[PDB]
Structures are given as C-alpha cells and as structure tokens.
Design a protein around this nucleic acid. Structure first.
Lengths: 398, 941, 400
DNA sequence: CGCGCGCCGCAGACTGTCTT
DNA sequence: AAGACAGTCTGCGGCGCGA
C-alpha cells in the first residue's frame, strides 16, 4: 500500500522526502523525478496521439499562462489585501495598491479560456466546418487552501466546437473515447469509472474517476456549454461566430474535455503496484510498455573483459537513435550482486534487462530478462532492436 | 353500438359476418365444463365499445373478400409464373459474352448488349466473388424467350467504392413503355433473396412492384424435412418407417433437383472459386464459372416447373401465395449509425476480451516466478505442470572527447551482428529459432511463436478455456486437481482418480465451469485465488461477449447499400432532420420465406427473437434499423398468437362459443389477478411459482408429457420420485389416461372374447384439453390446416406408415396456422395501403411482430389500417371455423407502436452504452384506443 | 516585413492586433502562436531533447515548478513578478504607498511566490537528490524545457518565453573544456537546420559571476539577436542554495570529492523559432523549413474524380501516414477548390514539404501526383510507395 | 420436447517435413 | 535419421437457437 517509498528510492516523485497524498492530489508537491517527468511525457504523447494527431479537425493551440488586461476578481477567495484584508482598520499613510484590481494580471486556471479566445481565428483556419477541435497540454495554477498556496496541475484540454443538434452525440462520443483511453494502459481497467453529472445551470456532462486505495478521485471532466462562454467572450455580433454545420450557419456549442495528467500519472502508478494468499513478494511497477519511462537496462557481465563497453556503447546508440529509451547501467560498479540490480530495475518499471557478458565476444548472445517474467533468455545482438520495436508496437496494438 | 355479450364481451357494429348462424342452443356442455372446480362465474368487467366504418368488402363474405384481395394482388405474378412454365427456351450460348453490363443471347447464340433484360418473368442467379465481399458478379438469367448474362468489375482493373451503390445489377424497368404488363415482374430462384440483395432497384425506398419466388420456400412447403427428419435423412444419405425419404429432400439445390426432376445429378465445381478462390482465378475461369451458374439456373427452372403445380394444388388459397410474395420484399432501412454500431460492438468485444486476457497474462507471469523451487509441493494447483528448460539456451577520472567523429562502436556492432553464421554451429541458424527455451514449457505453450504475423507479447494464447487457467485462478471443492483425464471422511469435491464428479449436471467427466457455475461462485463454494471478484468477473465478461462471439461474422458481414442523394425520395431530403453529410441505405434481410416445416420464415441474424439486453454485447442489432427522415416504423405484435390459435380450434371443436373450453376461457379472459389465468390455475393444482408454470405451459402445448415435466420439476425443486409420479395429477389438464386405459369411446373398459379390436374408432381426452383437434387434424385427409387449408409436407404425411412424428405434426398445426395468420395480415395490409394510398408499402416481419415503413404524415392512418387488419384477420380465423364471431378483447392490438427504430417496446435497449437516446433517437408512442379517433381516408383531422 | 504577414495569414502566429511590430515577438508579450507555430516549436523542442538529453548519457530530465514559494524569498532582492497569489502579477514596487508595506506585510516578502524567470534555479534545487541517481558521479547534468516569465517595459507587460535549459555539473578543472564542448555542440545543433548557417554565430563574453561565457546570436534582417547563452558559473549558486554543508553537495571524480562547477546553457525556443522562420524565407514566397522542423510534412488533396471514393482513399492514406508518424495536412474535405496554383502557393507559404494530389487515375492504377516544395517539380508515384518515400526523405534530411 | 445442430474452442494421435 | 517442429484429423465440451 505504501509504494511512495518506492517512488522515493527511484526518482519518479519530487525532491522532498515528505510527500503526503494531499500535496500530490492538490499539486503542491515540489515536482516529479526524472522518471516521473518521462512518465508524464509518455502519457502526454499517448493523449496527443489519441486525441489530436489522429483525430481530424483537431488542432494544437497555445494559451499564455497569464492574462494581461482588466479582469473581474476571478476565483480569488481572498480579495488580495486591498479591499477585504487591510492592515489595521484603515492604516492609510497616503490608494487601492495604486491600481486597485484593474491592472492586476491573472494566472490561468483552465485552458478553456485561451481556446475560446482563439475560436474565431482557428475557425478561419478551417473553412468554417463547424465540427472543430482545439487541444492543448499545459500547466494550470489553482489556489489551494490549508488550515493561499499555488497548486500546479498538468492538464490536457480539448475544446470541441460542435453544432448544437449534435452536442449530446459528441458528448457520448468523447465520453466513449476518453474512457476507453484511460481503460487502455491500465492493469485493472475496472478501477477507472465514469459518472454523468448536471451543472448548476442544468448543463449536463460527464466525470471520469480513478479508484485510488482511499477512494475515487476525479481525473477528467467533460462539460457541454450552450454557447454561453462563447457569446460572453464575443458579445458584439453573432455573424462572426457562425460556422457551417451543413448548408446552414449556426453558433457552436462548446464541449470542454479537461483531464489531468499529474493525478492521471498518479492513477497509473497506483495501478501498476499491487494482494492476498500469494506468499510471493516482488516489488515491481508493472507500467504499460507505452508509458514506462525507461524501456531497457544495459549492463556489462564481469568488467575484467573491458571490451564490453565498446559493444554496449554501440548498442546504446543503436537503440537510442531508434526511439528506445535505455538506462546506462554499464557505468555503475561495486554492485557485487545481480539480484538487487534486478529488484531496482523492476521498481523502476524497466521492461527488459539486457546484459552483455564475456561470452558475447564469440556467439554474440546477450542475456535478456523480462519485467513481467523473471525468466532469463539468450538473444543475438542482431534483431534486438527489431524485437524491442515489435514488443512496444504490439503492446500499443493490444 | 350495443354491448352484445353472448356470455362474454363481443364486438358490435361488426359491419362484417352477419346473422347466418344466430344461436347454438348447445351451451349445456360449455357451462358444465366451465363449472368444474370454479372457473365459471367471474366478473369480466366490460371493455369500451369501438364504432368504426370498416372499408367496403368486395366478396360479400369474409373468405370471399380475402380470396378476391389475394387474387387481385397475385394475378400478374401468377400469370408471369405460368409464362415461365410454358417456356421453349433455346439452348445455352456456345460462348458467354465478356462485355460489361447485360447481354442477351438470341438464336444460335449471338450476343447483343441490352440495358436490362426487358422480360416479364425471369429465373435468376447471382454468383459473387467473395474476395471483395458484398459485390455481385457473373450473374445469369433466363426468360421464356432467351438467355441473359450480367458482368461487372471483371472487364476493368480499378479500385472500387466498397460502399456498393451501383455494384448491384440492374433488373427492374423504368416503368416507361413496359411490355404489354404494367412492370409487374416475377423473379424465380433458389435462395432467391440472395439474388434480390444484388438488384439495383430493390434498395429504393419506394416500392418497385417486382416480386420474388423462392424455389427453396416452395420445396419446404411441398416436401420439406424437420430437424430430426433432416438429421435422419443426412444419416441415411423414424423406427420401422423409412419411406418418407423417397418423397423428401434437403434444401440443397442438387438434392431438390434430384427429388423433383431426377435427371443426371448436378455437378458443382470442386474449385469453388467463388467461395474461396480469388478474383483473378475467377477472371481466368470465366467460361466454366459462367457455364456452372447457367446450369444452376437451368436446374432451378426445371424445379420451378415441377413445383408450381404441386404448390398450387397443395396450397390452393391465393392468400398463401400473396403472403409469400409479400414476405419476399422485406426491407430494413439503416443509416450511418449502422457503421457506428458495428464499430462500437466490435470495440467493446475487443476491450472485454483484452481485459480478461490481460488478467490471465498477469496471473501466468506471476506464476512463472515459482521456477526457483520448481513448484515441488509448493503450489497445490501448479504442482502437476511441466517446468522444463531446454537442454541449452539457443541450442577513474574525468575525460572529454574532442570534435572527432568515430565509427568504432558502429563497426563493432556490425561485426557482432555478422556472427549469425556461428548459430549454425549451435544449430540455431535454422529457419525456425528455438521458442522461449528459458521459460517453463507451459508458458511456451501459452505464448505465440516468434515472428508470427499476429504476434503479441506474453501468453496471448490464453483464453480461459484451457486447463491451465483454473490451475491459475479457481480454488473449488477440496483444492482443484482440475483434470484427471479419466473417471474418505467427508469429501465435498472428489478427484481421487475416481468419481468423475464436480457437482456438474448429471455425471459429466469434464467441466471447464465457463457457465452455470455462477451460483456456486456466489455461494462461496467456488472461489478464485485472487479473490471473490475475479472468477465472477470472468464469467460475467464471458456472458457479455458470448453472443457477439457467436454472431459477429453474420452481423458485421451484412450487405448494406447506401443510397446517394439522387436516389433518395424528395420527402427525405426536404425533412428538417435530413443530414447532408449522413449516409442512408438499406439491408435486405435475405429471409427464406418458408424456411422450416410450418413454413416459418428463417433468417438467423434478423428473424431470431432476441431483443436488446442490459449485459450482452451487440444486442441492439434490431434497434439500429432506423427509419429515414420523414419516415417511421409503424408496427405491432400479435397478443398471444400461438396461445390464442391453440385456444381457438379447441373451443370450436367443443362448441360454437369461444370461451366454452376452460383453456380457451383462461386464454381469452383472465389476468394475473385471481386464479382466472392459465398460469395461476396451473400453479394452484401443484404448488409452484408462476414463472415455473409459465415455463411448463410454454412447452406443454408443444409435446412435453410426463418425462419433461418430471425432469424439470426435479431440476427446479429436487422433489422425491413420489411427487414425480404425482405429477400425473398435475398433467390432468392434458387429460391424462383419457385415450388398457380405463377410458375410451365405450364406457366399459373391461372386455373379453373379442375377435378383433373394438372401441378404437376415435381417441381423445376429456379434461380441459384442446389436443383433440390437433391430433385429429394431424391424422386426417390431404388438407391439414383449418384456415386457408395448406397441406403439411409429404414427408410428414401419415400415408401408409405413421412415421412416428406426432409431436412435430401437432406443433405444425399451430405454427402453420400462425404463418397463415401472418399471410392474412400481409394481404390485408397490402390491400389497405393500396386502396387508400397510404405511402410506405414496405414491411418487416419477425415471428408475430410485423412492422411497416410509413411516411410520418400517414403514420396514424397506417396504425388504423394495422388495427383494422388485426380485426379482419382474427375475424377471418373465426370465420373458417364455426364461431362466426369474435371477442372484443382480441379484436384489436393492445398497442400499435409508432417509432423511429425497431424495438420490442419504446423503453428498452439500455445495454452496454450509457445513453442509447444520446445517439439520435426519440421515443415512440404506442397508441391503442387513441388512434381510433381518426379515419383511414386521406382527409383526416 | 512580409514574412510576418505570411506567418499570420498561414497561422504560424496568432492574431495580428497585438503583434504588428517585431518587438512584441522578440519579447514574450505576443499573443501566442498559431497551430503551425506550435507544431514548429514542438518539433524544435523534440530535436533539442534528442540532441541534448536522449543521445547524451549523463543528462536527465528535471521538473521545476513555474512558481517559487519563497515564504523566505529575500526581502526586495531579485524580486520579479513577486505577487503569485494565483490572481496577481505585479512585478516590482519601485514606488510604493508604504503604509504597512508595499502592498501588505503578508502580501509582500511573505507570500512572494516569485514566478520563475529562469530554469537554472529549479535544476539547482534538484541537484542533491538527482546526485543519487548518477551514483554521485558529479559530471552529470539536468535538462528542462519550460516557460519563463520576464518583465516587458506605463504598465509592465509580462513576457513569456519558452526556454530550453541544461545545467551541467562538472569538475572545476574540466569546466572550461566542457564549456567549449557545449558551445560547439549547441552551435552545430543551431546550424544543423539552418539554410544559411553563416547567420547563426557565437561570441565570447566575460562576467563577474562567471569568468567564461558564450553567447549565440542569429543575424536577423535588422540585426543580431541573442538566441542562446552559455555561462561557466562557479560553485557560488550551489553553495548559496546549500550553505555550510559542503559534505552533502560534493560529488566524486576519480575517487576525489569536489564541489561541482555549474554550467548554464539557456536557449530561447521562441526566438529560435522566429530565427528559423526568417531563415526559411528568402519571387516565389515559400518557407523552406528543414524537413525535421517543418510542422506539417505532406498535404493530401482530392481532384478530378468521384468525391466519395476519392475521399475514402484519401482517408485511408491519411490514416496510414499518421500511423507511421508522418503529420499530414488534410487538404481534402475542402470543396471550394479555387485552383492548383493557388493551392501550391498556399502550401508553400505553410512550409509543406510535399503536395499529394489523388485523382481518378489513382483509382485506376494507384498513381498520385506529388509536388515538391523545394524543386517545384511534379512526379507520379504509387500509393504504397508514398509512406516509405516520405520516411526515407525525412531520414535522409536528418542525417547529412 | 427429448433435447440435438451449426459454430467455437481445447487437446491429443499422427504424419510428413526440414533441419539436423 | 531423428527429433524437433509444423499441419492435419478427431475426440470432447459449451452457447445461442430451435424444436
């Protein structure tokens, strides 16, 4: 149950040793280790492949982390220190901080706002074909209250402009595609679930959750909007907001699918770790091959041979230039044991352990150990690239 | 107007039948029969009266009316068939034409290109390549005058649409300057619906008044085989009765031709290029494949010539032919949502299988770690597996590099990869490399071979059916040595090299517990290692995916033809819900009009009675049949068609009243409240649940008897043999021991000094049983159906020996009566739609349910027509017996559903997807008594 | 001048209301980039990651937060964007209504949350923990690509620049050699995708914090602009972050423990993107971006044939290209079809390597027309060979 | 109506092959 | 020549469906 210690030993989590679940969920943790950054990169790449590049009419957009003009108080529980919290009662030597809240900037809380700002130009990009998408992965800042803090969350947001008639159909479509995407890569897909919800204005949507050991936590939310925010953004004229559903021009309904990757990456780490009657204890993070930060671990057999580094470096270059991430395990020395090395690589979610021995100079069969099975095999230096590529691709397929 | 009850509610303002048979005065027998026990005096609250001006009847009598309607409908097609009968067809062409399109062959075989055959009658056959399925090719037809051939996509080598718009052949005329009839054309064929599916104009939403005759349907009506009869016929290539095989045959064209024509046997290509051959080999074998198809057409023509007189003399009523012609034009409209449904069902199947498989892979991978101790008395389940490894595997400081490009590492890698030759010295360089020598042998068995086209990592072959999977996760009675490959204190589960027992049904050796062990899972006596959820979850997933596993090839391979904008009617395009980017098309279900004995229509995909269920995947197949914009599905199901048809023919056999028989009384009147219903009365005699009585009775009508009843009672309640014997008392509804037996036609059972048999003139029970009529008509003269008499097949005729198929024949009586009811409904509906110009002639029919694709503006009118049909048809039934009247309760459909999709009710088909209404769908409106406010004439409210 | 209009019209840059001048682009105060600009930046960042992180063996990713909590931020010392209440972006209170404080004692120097102006400090904060990963081998390094916020000069605009930063910990004796090595590698990487490498340049500069430094410039039409800076910082920052306990912060080099010297390599990916856009531009208006850097590789169209079946085969080719990692602009699905010359000019201005036209002849024999951006030559090619040809072309362009 | 018939799947003779 | 490895046939068991 306490796999956070494994996250500490192998740097998938941030620098600080004390990492409560509340900090991880809120986004107040110091950050993620290099393995955590790589896992986030893989997760974001999979999201981009599933949602953006394969899907037609969905385009990237970048929204600035900040807003530079006058904006209403927004989502500030504390009214700065100028209107609600003033020193003493008045304590005024000389103004509302010399600008009140007029010139104050704002840190983005969601990626929807920038997509709505880019709606008109990105509708010009397409030939006003109304089914349209704007996707973006970025960091969003939220206030966190403790009994003032800033929580940073990596969110992938898709803003889908749709004809009003097809809005519910596209809601079901994306609820079906996002849910199955989360189900895929999961060792226990049942832990991912969905729930239909209604907004305070009656605007229905969906919410996806992952069942962490303590309970269900929200990882994604789909919301359908009746061109409310779109019209509020552009109250001047409706003609410039019109897109072509068919031969007719209509103002789109906005479907915002907002998922988080940090709590999404938290959900996959918990899924990988696993719990009765086994009497067989082996701490391993059985991450999906597509999300595992490091695929293969390279080593050297004895070290007196000293001709293993050359071939190991060549294999390193061959694998890296072919898109396989490799752990340079042939530099570390004074290990004195192969069991602890295997345990380490298991806890790092290393799919394969490749070991080059003094028996590789002749009959160049390297030793291969698997994460899933602790079984040793012999495989030629040739076609190892092809075997690993096939493994990753077939894991992608199924 | 008036109530008009003759002891029970009957319809008034009849406007049909009359007062020819006023009063029976023989009610002395019916009152006494209803008086035994209770069952006689119930309240029977009245029903509201219905006043309606029925359309005029031409025949001045109900039977004459229906005969006139059927004759007027089927006259052009009957005379087209007769033109086919008197056909002096010239010989086959010497060389078939390679030209594209349709080619006609005149005297001495000259080839002339023609747009279409331009023939009133045709015998038609289409052979499809099937390398690119759904596309027709190599078609061949004959008319009374000449031969015709049809070619497409073999002259040109080009990429094709794959949507099959103009792939179907063109066979219907343009209605302009037609020969003589008014484009009334009949197309004859063996499995003619398959050939109909490849006709260009058959997919238009508007009717084309081209009808299709199936030689298979007429064969099954004339001389067909039941299931047991078919099995015995195949076995012989019915104890002490083997003369029905000379007059019967299987549905194959060769055997049918042998039976009816009996010429030289038909020769089929052993290459079968159309079934498994590629498009290329079909292209080179054009003449031979063209010669075989034409020979099949000739065989079908000769069979049709030998069949039509026999069918007409065995089914004299024109209603039968009209109904078959109407069943031959079934039509299922579909839209772009069909492709979405196929994709979503396949995807759900794939992810459910992937989830189960991945759980299996995880268990296998975790089990592989026990190789350290080799599982010697370590794992109680994996102690018997094989854990073998093949004999031999594969048989300082800180430095900085300057700007110097070096290839030493790459050269070393290339040299290392050059050492594949040394694998020959290790005997590994062979074409097949060693497969997973390190892993245990069972794990290799579960893992796909390397370099496979469909290779996947891990033990991907695991599918929960293998004997290893329970050894992974299935802790059953007393551990689980699952398989013994052969046949103490208190041992709940015994595997001690003896007693092949795991609490299975009867005493079966094997039991993979993929089904019917769920109650053992919930009981707790059958648990999985990982927990109490894994085993039940696997069984649940199996339940969801079983139907799709069985039916995905059939469902996904359905011929769908998508109409373009031009082909759609003007009403569809101008509808507000018209989708310019959407796809609209149709599926012709490919039904056999008379598929089985009883002439019941057969289609495994569509006509199967299976509505959408919450759990099973892909079960919304019917719900995807969605009307186009501006159209709707107006349809209804017959309320207890089989049970009512059984209730009638028993009351008429007893007296002139409908409710005279106790079974007929409870069928006509009586609801779940009180014991007035059949199920409650059955459960009253012997204490059982109403569901148990329902399951008993449905089956009690069709055979059953003491053995089935006692075995099912044992299965349900596990009663002692004494109560099984006492079930003879419960079988008193069937009048057990009526008719050595103590009861017969003579009152005195005891007799002696009898030279010959006596008191054996007639047989029948006398205790709340309708089986007397069914048994009497089962063993009767040539005509065997009371309503529009159509004879049973010559296979089941009781001529000479009995053949011991009594159950099949008594079932045939009711089921063929139901088919006659369906034909009556179809002819009445066709007449009503044609007379009053109700748009949307098309129809679908699944068992008792019948639906029509109707323009929405006419939808309510169609519903009224449907209700009127349900009157006349039922009245027609009552007319063909001595009733001469109908109850008000059964006079009309309980509800006529007007919907946009095909579902049993409006509130169904939840199924796997969360929001079936989330997809574009709107609730229908079963009408009932409301639709009567309108009138069938076009001038409506 | 015209290049900015081309980039805005072709959706390389965002709306033109705010970025008429080039100064807004050089700073981060421009209103973002268009989808094509975002894709070009993503390609540039991926290439930087491959050249600096993946291929290099001692370099690891590092996660640095955008905001620096600094409940202990120094009082008015390096105080940039020090509001960070999540709803305020005041930069510096040079003039202040000092009643209680600049704004308030709790809201000034206590709830500072200074927004990050550089990625170096985040990497330094992770130095000790990431030292364990490399087994206390001190010549390792850390890398990150992230957005950094800077002042822009009545009101103070906030400029966002996506910067790629490598913090290389090295032994002090080899610090200058590693500095020269990284200078050479960075310069070669910047010149790898350049049509005119002479525009990209390097200069040597001195500083009090670091004796040795290097600055990379790109020669824009107006003048040279800095695109990357290399600084041989001492151990001052590491000692300041961890004061007094040298024993924890020193790694091992040849069994000798030494406090690492820090090298900061910081490149501006937005200014690099603008530099490569200006390099691409040069009568025919075409953006000859490098094949590895170009956002969209091939443009797929339909013409002169049945709309439906040509659409289906184009969809199939589109899916096939996407499955193999080739990004394609779905030029089909567009019904106006103004002209072929206008289409080619448009796709040239969008820096599309190849224009693929599918016609009825493609249905007959499978031949599609393929027009090249560089050679402006048209060639007939089979459908099946297109994916392999594109993969080979990109690979050949990658490796000169 | 006592229950078989198709498809679907698992597992074991056995044969023919292709390396050795 | 033989043994490892492929394709066959040929048994036993479910699963929806009909009888």
């Amino acid at each position: 149950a306490l796999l956070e210690i494994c996250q500490r030993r192998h740097f998938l989590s941030g620098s600080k040793q004390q990492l409560s679940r509340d900090s991880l969920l809120s986004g107040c943790h110091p950050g993620f280790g290099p393995l955590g950054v790589e896992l986030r990169k893989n997760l974001a790449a999979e999201w981009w492949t599933s949602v953006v590049v394969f899907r037609e009419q969905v385009f990237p957009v970048d929204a600035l982390h900040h807003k530079p003009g006058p904006l209403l108080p927004g989502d500030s529980a504390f009214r700065l220190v100028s209107a609600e919290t003033l020193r003493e009662i008045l304590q005024d030597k000389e103004a509302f901080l010399e600008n009140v809240l007029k010139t104050s900037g704002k840190l983005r809380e969601n990626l929807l706002h920038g997509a709505l700002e880019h709606y008109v130009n990105c509708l010009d990009l397409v030939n006003k074909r109304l089914p349209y998408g704007l996707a973006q992965i970025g960091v969003c800042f939220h206030p966190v209250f403790d009994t003032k803090s800033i929580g940073e969350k990596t969110e992938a947001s898709l803003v889908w402009f749709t004809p009003p008639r097809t809005s519910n159909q596209w809601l079901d479509f994306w609820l079906r595609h996002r849910l199955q995407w989360w189900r895929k890569f999961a060792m226990s897909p049942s832990n991912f679930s969905s729930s239909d919800c209604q907004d305070e204005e009656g605007r229905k949507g969906n919410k996806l959750y992952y069942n962490f050991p303590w309970g269900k936590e929200l990882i994604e939310t789909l919301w359908n909007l009746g061109d409310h925010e779109l019209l509020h953004m552009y109250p001047g004229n409706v003609s410039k907001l019109h897109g072509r559903d068919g031969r007719k021009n209509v103002v789109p309904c906005v479907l915002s699918v907002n998922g988080d990757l940090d709590r999404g990456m938290l959900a996959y780490l918990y899924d990988s770790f696993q719990t009765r009657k086994k009497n067989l204890h082996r701490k391993v993070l059985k991450l999906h091959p597509c999300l595992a930060p490091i695929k293969v671990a390279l080593d050297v057999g004895r070290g007196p041979t000293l001709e293993l580094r050359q071939v190991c470096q060549g294999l390193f270059n061959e694998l890296l230039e072919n898109g396989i991430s490799v752990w340079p395990g042939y530099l570390e020395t004074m290990q004195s044991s192969l069991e602890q090395l295997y345990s380490k690589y298991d806890e790092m979610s290393i799919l394969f352990t490749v070991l080059v021995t003094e028996t590789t100079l002749e009959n160049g069969l390297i030793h291969l150990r698997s994460r899933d099975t602790t079984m040793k095999e012999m495989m030629h230096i040739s076609k190892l690239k092809d075997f690993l590529i096939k493994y990753i691709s077939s894991a992608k397929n199924v | 107007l008036d109530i008009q009850m003759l002891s029970r509610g009957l319809h008034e303002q009849i406007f049909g039948q009359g007062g020819e048979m006023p009063g029976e005065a023989a009610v002395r027998r019916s009152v006494e029969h209803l008086q035994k026990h209770g069952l006689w005096g119930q309240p029977a609250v009245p029903l509201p009266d219905v006043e309606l001006r029925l359309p005029p009847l031409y025949g001045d009598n109900l039977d004459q009316h229906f005969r006139l309607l059927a004759q007027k409908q089927s006259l052009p097609y009957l005379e087209a068939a007769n033109l086919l009968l008197q056909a002096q067809l010239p010989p086959k062409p010497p060389a078939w034409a390679w030209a594209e399109g349709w080619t006609r062959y005149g005297p001495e075989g000259e080839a002339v290109p023609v747009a279409i055959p331009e023939e009133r009658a045709l015998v038609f056959d289409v052979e499809v390549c099937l390398a690119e399925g759904t596309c027709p090719t190599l078609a061949v037809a004959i008319s009374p005058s000449a031969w015709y051939s049809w070619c497409s996509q073999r002259l040109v080598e080009e990429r094709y649409s794959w949507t099959s718009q103009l792939s179907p052949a063109d066979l219907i005329p343009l209605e302009v300057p037609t020969g003589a009839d008014w484009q009334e054309q009949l197309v004859v064929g063996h499995n003619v619906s398959f050939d109909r599916a490849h006709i260009r104009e058959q997919y238009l939403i508007q009717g084309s008044r081209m009808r299709f005759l199936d030689t298979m349907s007429m064969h099954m009506a004339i001389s067909g085989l039941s299931s047991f009869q078919r099995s015995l016929w195949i076995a012989a290539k019915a104890i002490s009765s083997w003369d029905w095989l000379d007059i019967s045959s299987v549905n194959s064209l060769a055997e049918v031709h042998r039976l009816y024509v009996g010429g030289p046997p038909l020769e089929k290509e052993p290459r079968e290029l159309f079934v498994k051959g590629t498009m290329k080999d079909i292209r080179e074998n054009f003449q031979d494949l063209m010669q075989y198809c034409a020979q099949d057409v000739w065989a079908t023509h000769e069979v049709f010539q030998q069949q039509l007189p026999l069918f007409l003399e065995r089914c004299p009523h024109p209603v039968t032919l009209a109904g078959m012609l109407e069943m031959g034009v079934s039509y299922l409209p579909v839209n772009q949502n069909w492709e979405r449904y196929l994709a979503e069902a396949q995807g759900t199947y794939e992810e459910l299988q992937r989830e189960m498989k991945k759980s299996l892979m995880d268990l296998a991978n975790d089990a592989c770690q026990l190789l350290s101790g080799e599982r010697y008395k370590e794992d109680p389940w994996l102690w018997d597996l094989e854990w073998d490894l093949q004999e031999f595997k594969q048989k300082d400081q800180e430095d900085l590099g300057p700007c110097s490009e070096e290839e030493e590492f790459q050269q070393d890698v290339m040299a290392r990869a050059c050492l594949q030759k040394l694998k020959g010295t290790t005997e590994l360089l062979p074409k097949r490399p060693q497969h997973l020598p390190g892993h245990p042998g069972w794990y290799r068995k579960l893992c796909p071979r390397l370099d496979d086209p469909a290779w996947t990592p891990g033990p991907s072959l695991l599918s929960l059916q293998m004997r290893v999977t329970p050894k992974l996760m299935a802790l059953t009675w007393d551990g689980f040595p699952l398989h013994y490959s052969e046949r103490d204190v208190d041992i709940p589960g015994c595997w001690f090299f003896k007693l092949p027992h795991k609490d299975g049904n009867s005493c079966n050796v094997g039991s993979p517990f993929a089904k019917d062990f769920l109650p053992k899972m919930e009981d707790g006596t059958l648990q999985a290692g990982p927990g109490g959820a894994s085993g039940p979850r696997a069984l649940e997933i199996n339940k969801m995916i079983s139907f799709w596993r069985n039916a995905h090839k059939r469902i996904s391979s359905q011929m769908v033809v998508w109409l373009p904008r031009s082909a759609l009617p003007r009403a569809v395009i101008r509808h507000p819900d018209y989708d310019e980017e959407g796809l609209y098309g149709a599926i012709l279900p490919q039904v056999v009009t008379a598929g089985t004995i009883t002439r019941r229509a057969v289609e495994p995909t569509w006509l199967t009675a299976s509505n959408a269920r919450p759990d099973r995947v892909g079960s919304e197949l019917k719900a995807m049949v969605q009307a186009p914009p501006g159209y709707t599905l107006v349809g209804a199901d017959v309320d207890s068609q089989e049970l009512w048809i059984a209730a009638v023919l028993g009351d008429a056999h007893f007296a002139g009243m409908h409710g005279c028989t106790a079974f007929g009384w409870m069928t006509l009147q009586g609801r779940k409240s009180r014991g007035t219903d059949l199920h409650s009365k059955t459960a009253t005699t012997v204490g059982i649940s109403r569901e148990h009585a329902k399951i008993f009775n449905y089956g009690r009508i069709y055979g059953a008897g003491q053995p089935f009843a006692e075995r099912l009672l044992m299965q349900f309640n596990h009663r002692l043999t004494q109560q099984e014997a006492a079930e003879k008392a419960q079988q008193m509804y069937a009048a057990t021991k009526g008719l050595k037996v103590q009861r017969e036609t003579a009152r005195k059972s005891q007799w002696k000094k009898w030279e010959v048999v006596a008191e054996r003139a007639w047989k029948g029970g006398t205790e709340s049983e309708m089986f007397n009529k069914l048994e009497s008509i089962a063993t009767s003269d040539i005509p065997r159906t009371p309503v529009l008499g159509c004879c049973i097949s010559r296979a089941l005729e009781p001529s000479a020996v009995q053949e011991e198929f009594m159950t099949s024949r008594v079932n045939w009586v009711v089921q063929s009566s139901a088919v006659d009811y369906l034909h009556l409904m179809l002819v009445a509906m066709k007449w009503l739609f044609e007379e009053f110009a109700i748009d949307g002639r098309f129809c679908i029919s699944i068992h008792d349910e019948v639906r029509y694709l109707v323009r929405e503006e006419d939808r309510y009118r169609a519903a009224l027509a449907l209700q009127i049909t349900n009157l006349l048809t039922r009245c027609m039934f009552a007319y063909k017996l001595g009733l001469n009247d109908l109850p008000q309760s059964v006079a009309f459909f309980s509800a006529v559903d007007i919907d946009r999709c095909l579902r049993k009710e409006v509130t169904m088909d939840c199924k796997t997807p969360s929001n079936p209404t989330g997809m574009e769908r709107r609730y229908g409106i079963p009408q009932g008594e409301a639709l009567d406010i309108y009138q069938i004439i076009e001038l409506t409210k």
